[PDB]
Amino acid sequence: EMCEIPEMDSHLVEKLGQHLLPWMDRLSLEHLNPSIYVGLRLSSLQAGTKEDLYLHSLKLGYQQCLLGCQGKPSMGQLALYLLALRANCEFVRGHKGDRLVSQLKWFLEDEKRAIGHDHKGHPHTSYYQYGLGILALCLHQKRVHDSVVDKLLYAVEPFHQGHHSVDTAAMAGLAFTCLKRSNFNPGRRQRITMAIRTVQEEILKAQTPEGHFGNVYSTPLALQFLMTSPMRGAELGTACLKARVALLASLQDGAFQNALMISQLLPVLNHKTYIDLIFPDCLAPRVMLEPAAETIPQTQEIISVTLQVLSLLPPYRQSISVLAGSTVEDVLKKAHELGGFTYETQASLSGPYLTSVMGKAAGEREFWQLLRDPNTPLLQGIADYRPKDGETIELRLVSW
Amino acid sequence: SCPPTKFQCRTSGLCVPLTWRCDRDLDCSDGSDEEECLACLAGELRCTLSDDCIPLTWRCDGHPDCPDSSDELGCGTN
Ligand code: CNC
Ligand SMILES: [Ca+2]
Ligand SMILES: [Ca+2]
Ligand SMILES: [Ca+2]
Ligand SMILES: [Ca+2]
């Protein structure tokens, strides 16, 4: 059976795109987002001339910062920039292009070395970024050595060490699919074929009773991967229809606010995936997005949220009053204003990432986890999760 | 129609840095920007005309990782 997601309501799709639209005018390097560009080009929606300026800004920023900048882009982000080039039917080229390719190849080589011949060491970033890097190079018909592919193969193959999310497995599966379709790494062809099936099975076995694969925000990338190949013996069609039901409910309940998440979902709703960047169709008609004329406004209600940090001595626990509809980040700002609380964030393609709390920065294989009561990890970051009145938000330094 | 310390793409108003003016790359859609013109680690190999080291596995992989492309030269091999 095949993984098919029947077209959703055009109105519903349009309002998703309108969430992306304001970002088209935010061209500062801290806000530039190659995933947004890619998601839009693969969608049924377009931003017209704004897109061309956006790509131009991407090319200026990424090439000047990495070859010649305030907090220049990461290698993982460089990989997504490569996807953005494919989305405009370009191959990375010229002397500047060649150098960018080799920088991404160095990233993979360093992660391979960090992982080790034994496969105990972690990558310095994630296996998600490792897969993303292989995919990005493959989409531009750039080859990586079998030894590089081997680390991704071992990570998903039987008796592998560690546990990977649905997102990570899906990204790996996409990388494997590009290698297979391109007939790259022929000395790993059978293992690559087997790994794709392995990822299929693990993703299907991660489907919740609601219908999501892992969770609501893993479902988009999971669907992208599942759409790329048949799955004989399995009921892929049924699983994907159940996911659509789950996806539809989540959409109608306002689950998708984050621009990166929308950019990963929009291709699915247009029956496209990142694998369509092998043979891109850049001139396919797309509906022009117009700004949602919209009176947003304004709450009159005050809510109180308890903010707590038990990972530090002495511990922090305070009730914070904010306007209803405020984010966790607003709570953090208010806590800082009241005195006795500090924190730090850094920019990412998903928005502000919490890196430090009350002077304590997360170290290697550590992060500040966001939770609500009771002991329940948030599915959104500080700038997207909007706590309800009486909620308790915890920041917890954890190791993974 | 926009600042100094920087060259402009003539045929479509997009504006680009001067490090790209006459640099063999087609950065402008029209191509105007080109017209008025140490030890190596084990398992690595040195690029013939420079200081650079690359992994041995980048030899003959279809992409010039060396500035002089020496890693892709004797690559019609057996
Ligand atoms: C790896 C990973 C993943 N994560 Co995290 C998970 N699990 N994540 C990160 C890890 C980063 C560290 C590392 N060494 O890689 C990890 C485990 C620590 C992290 C943290 C969690 N993650 C979380 C979620 C919910 C997000 N994460 C994802 C991006 C989920 C991702 C899956 C996905 N579908 O995208 C994910 C698989 C891949 C991200 C990536 O590398 N993209 C490629 C990269 C090139 O882009 P980038 O923007 O430069 O990557 C940076 C950011 O993604 C930042 N970051 C990671 N997660 C988030 C989440 C938010 C909300 C923000 C603003 C930034 C981040 O870390 C990366 C830098 O290394 C997201 C889809 C995952 C999911 N399916 O649930 C989701 C995000 C959902 C959404 N509505 O936006 C947490 C909030 C969980 C929690 N309750 O604490 C938390 C972030 C808290 C904080 N301190 O701000
Ligand atoms: Ca969201
Ligand atoms: Ca520590
Ligand atoms: Ca040039
Ligand atoms: Ca080479």
Author numbering:
A (entry chain A): 1 to 68, 78 to 409
B (entry chain C): 53 to 89, 130 to 170
Text from the published report:
Mammals depend on dietary uptake of Cobalamin (Cbl), which is a cofactor of at least two enzymes that are part of essential biochemical pathways. CD320 is a member of the Low-density Lipoprotein Receptor (LDLR) family, a large group of mostly multi-ligand receptors involved in cholesterol uptake and other physiologically essential functions. CD320 features an N-terminal, extracellular fragment comprising two LDLR type A (LDLR-A) domains separated by an epidermal growth factor (EGF) homology domain, the exact function of which has so far not been determined. While the majority of related LDLR domain-containing receptors bind multiple and distinct ligands, CD320 has been reported to bind TC with high specificity and affinity as evidenced by the lack of interference in TC binding from related LDLR ligands like LDL and RAP as well as high affinity for TC of both the full-length receptor and its soluble ectodomain81318.
